[PDB]
């Protein structure tokens, strides 16, 4: 379990070193964007969150493409990672599911949170919000899913 190295934690698997730098560059940046940069504007502070979620998202896409896509590590490396909280079991369990393959997050699928309905506009393919841009004519007024900053999260876009 614990991110911290400590004595309980089963020492590293083997090919670890070959990836270890790529990992650490994400890691420093988390320590970088937790650094309390003040701003008077709410639009910012929410952006600030959108970083940590972005990075987190990349690390998981990375370990993910290694293990499943190109199969560039061995199951015990991988499973040791996931045990250490390097990446989301869950999220990757979505990227295994059919359509989601590019999914943002675990909020952006939530049915139960949203007021009504479901599934932040984060999900909808551009090819439709473009359609309301056609008929109604306002172009398409969406930019950042309040949770993330997704744009065209659905795997077509």
């Amino acid at each position: 379990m614990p991110r911290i190295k400590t004595r309980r934690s089963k020492p590293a698997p083997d090919g670890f070193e070959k990836i270890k730098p790529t990992l650490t560059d994400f890691e420093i940046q988390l320590r970088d964007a937790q650094k309390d940069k003040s701003s008077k504007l709410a639009a910012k502070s929410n952006e600030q969150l959108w970083e940590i979620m972005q990075l987190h998202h990349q690390r998981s896409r990375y370990i993910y493409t290694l293990y499943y896509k190109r199969k560039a590590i061995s199951k015990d490396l991988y499973d040791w990672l996931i045990k250490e909280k390097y990446a989301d079991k869950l999220l990757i369990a979505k990227w295994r599911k059919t359509g989601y393959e590019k999914l943002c997050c675990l909020r952006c699928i939530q049915k139960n949170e949203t007021n009504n309905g479901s599934t932040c506009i984060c999900r909808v393919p551009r090819a439709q919000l473009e359609e309301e841009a056609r008929k109604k004519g306002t172009q398409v007024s969406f930019h950042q899913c309040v949770h993330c900053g997704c744009r065209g999260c659905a795997s077509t876009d």
Binding site: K102, A127, H143, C148, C150, R151, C153, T156
Partner: peptide
């Protein structure tokens, strides 16, 4: 719409997926 149309169409967004900005 068509698959080719979409595949070509997306690269338009600035930064891969999905945080890449349309426009």
């Amino acid at each position: 719409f068509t698959k080719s149309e979409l595949k070509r169409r997306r690269k338009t967004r600035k930064g891969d997926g999905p945080w890449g900005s349309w426009s």
